[PDB]
């Protein structure tokens, strides 16, 4: 089944593993589908429902890659770490320039949020990448720069209810909002409706596997204090 939820299914019980894109070396593309994070969990699933079936059946291992790559990097170009998508605003914006993303919430939530983009170049300690190279902290910082001061619509978690909204989707790609200083987004995951509830499929760190949320994304969201709302994006194909 072709399909974003559906192929997001097809992850659960997958690990849960922190930095798998992080190898020494140069940046090159990284394909590690069985061990995952947020982000990673929904870019192979967005690669994967992007490449059309063969005639034969099942989809081109080549094909995946490209599209995939497409995903990860700005404008598809592997050219260092800062060519990696690192911000989900970033990724969004490919997405919706290159012409395979939209953005659901810029189309309903009349709220805004305006972009404060600071996080990695403020704690390069926690990136291998910046930890040790000053000339990719100060690249980081020109696209920081680029992406902050811009506003994007947003749905505040308090307009969210358990039983999501008719124009939240199966399928659809939901980024959580955040208050931590210098970041836009701290979560991703798949909107998955089950006995009239909106919920997730998601990389967990805290269950060590991808899991379906055992509560509403309405509920994960008021127990979370620095989680402020969602952007909702879907595939366009
Ligand atoms: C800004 C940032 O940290 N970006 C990284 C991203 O973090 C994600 C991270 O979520 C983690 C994985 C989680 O919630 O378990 C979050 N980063 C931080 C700093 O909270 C944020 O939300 C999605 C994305 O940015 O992960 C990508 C894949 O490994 C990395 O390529 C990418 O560098
Ligand atoms: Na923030």
Known sequence: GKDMLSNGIKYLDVPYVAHTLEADGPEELVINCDEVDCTTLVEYVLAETLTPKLADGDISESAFADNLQKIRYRDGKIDGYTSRLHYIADWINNGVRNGFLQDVTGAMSPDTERLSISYMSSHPQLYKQLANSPENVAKMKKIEQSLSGKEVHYLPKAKLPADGLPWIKDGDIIAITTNTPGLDV??????????????LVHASSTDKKVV???VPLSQMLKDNNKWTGIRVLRMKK
């Open 212 to 214: 379906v949320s055992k």
């Open 186 to 199: 701290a979560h991703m995951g798949i909107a998955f409706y089950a006995d009239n509830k909106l919920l």
